[PDB]
Amino acid sequence: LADQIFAYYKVMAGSLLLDKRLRSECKNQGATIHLPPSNRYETLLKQRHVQLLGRSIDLNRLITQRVSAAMYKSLELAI
Amino acid sequence: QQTQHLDSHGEPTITSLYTNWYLETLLRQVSNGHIAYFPAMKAFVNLPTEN
Amino acid sequence: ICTEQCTLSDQLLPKHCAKTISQAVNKEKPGVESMRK
């Protein structure tokens, strides 16, 4: 879950900042840079007392740990 | 001087020009129904209409 | 001079890279004006 969440938001960030005129031009030559399908991750990110076998699991905390590791990896790779 | 409605010489600066355009063309055509606000793209995008 | 520099600096806009991306998927350059032979 953490892996695909980070991938989804990285792709959305990259797609938001791409030149719009470039997308138009590419579509006009049949080389469309496809948009990323929308997805519903908001409800999962807000979970904080998931119940399993008598334990209360804070999903938000674990997702944050994995995503922060991924962000650090991305910055390191860029540099 | 170009951040004010008019310059020190009483002439239209780019603040006024762009404000006038954004209200009297973009949002007008949005209210007509030829444009829509996509929160996905964080922009306004032409709808695929006849016009 | 400012007109010339604007023409030079608008050739770096992303809108001019459509052909390259289309070629890369399906299948002049800046800095050449400053090469003094």
Swiss-Prot record, chain A:
It is found in: Cytoplasm; Cytoplasm, Perinuclear region; Cell projection, Lamellipodium; Cell projection, Ruffle. Component of the CYFIP1-EIF4E-FMR1 complex which binds to the mRNA cap and mediates translational repression. In the CYFIP1-EIF4E-FMR1 complex this subunit is an adapter between EIF4E and FMR1. Promotes the translation repression activity of FMR1 in brain probably by mediating its association with EIF4E and mRNA. Regulates formation of membrane ruffles and lamellipodia. Plays a role in axon outgrowth. Binds to F-actin but not to RNA. Part of the WAVE complex that regulates actin filament reorganization via its interaction with the Arp2/3 complex. It comes from Homo sapiens. It comes from the Eukaryota. This is Cytoplasmic FMR1-interacting protein 1. The chain holds residues 706 to 784 of 1253 of the full protein. Component of the WAVE1 complex composed of ABI2, CYFIP1 or CYFIP2, BRK1, NCKAP1 and WASF1/WAVE1. Within the complex, a heterodimer containing NCKAP1 and CYFIP1 interacts with a heterotrimer formed by WAVE1, ABI2 and BRK1. Component of the CYFIP1-EIF4E-FMR1 complex which is composed of CYFIP, EIF4E and FMR1. Interacts with FMR1 but does not bind to related proteins FXR1 or FXR2. Interaction with EIF4E stimulates FMR1 binding. Component of the WAVE2 complex composed of ABI1, CYFIP1/SRA1, NCKAP1/NAP1 (NCKAP1l/HEM1 in hematopoietic cells) and WASF2/WAVE2. Belongs to the CYFIP family. Breakpoint hotspot for the Prader-Willi/Angelman syndromes and may be implicated in autism. Commonly altered in tumors. The gene is CYFIP1.
Curated annotation (Swiss-Prot), chain C:
It is found in: Cell membrane; Cell projection, Lamellipodium membrane. Coiled coil: none annotated. Expressed in all tissues examined except peripheral blood leukocytes, with highest expression in brain, heart, and skeletal muscle. Expressed in cells of various brain regions including Purkinje cells and dentate nucleus of the cerebellum, CA4 region and dentate gyrus of the hippocampus, and in frontal gray and white matter. Part of the WAVE complex that regulates lamellipodia formation. The WAVE complex regulates actin filament reorganization via its interaction with the Arp2/3 complex. Actin remodeling activity is regulated by RAC1. As component of the WAVE1 complex, required for BDNF-NTRK2 endocytic trafficking and signaling from early endosomes. Belongs to the HEM-1/HEM-2 family. Component of the WAVE1 complex composed of ABI2, CYFIP1 or CYFIP2, BRK1, NCKAP1 and WASF1/WAVE1. Within the complex, a heterodimer containing NCKAP1 and CYFIP1 interacts with a heterotrimer formed by WAVE1, ABI2 and BRK1. Component of the WAVE2 complex composed of ABI1, CYFIP1/SRA1, NCKAP1/NAP1 and WASF2/WAVE2. CYFIP2 binds to activated RAC1 which causes the complex to dissociate, releasing activated WASF1. The complex can also be activated by NCK1. Associates preferentially with the first SH3 domain of NCK. Interacts with NYAP1, NYAP2 and MYO16. Interacts with TMEM132D. (Microbial infection) Interacts with human cytomegalovirus protein UL135. This is Nck-associated protein 1. The gene is NCKAP1.
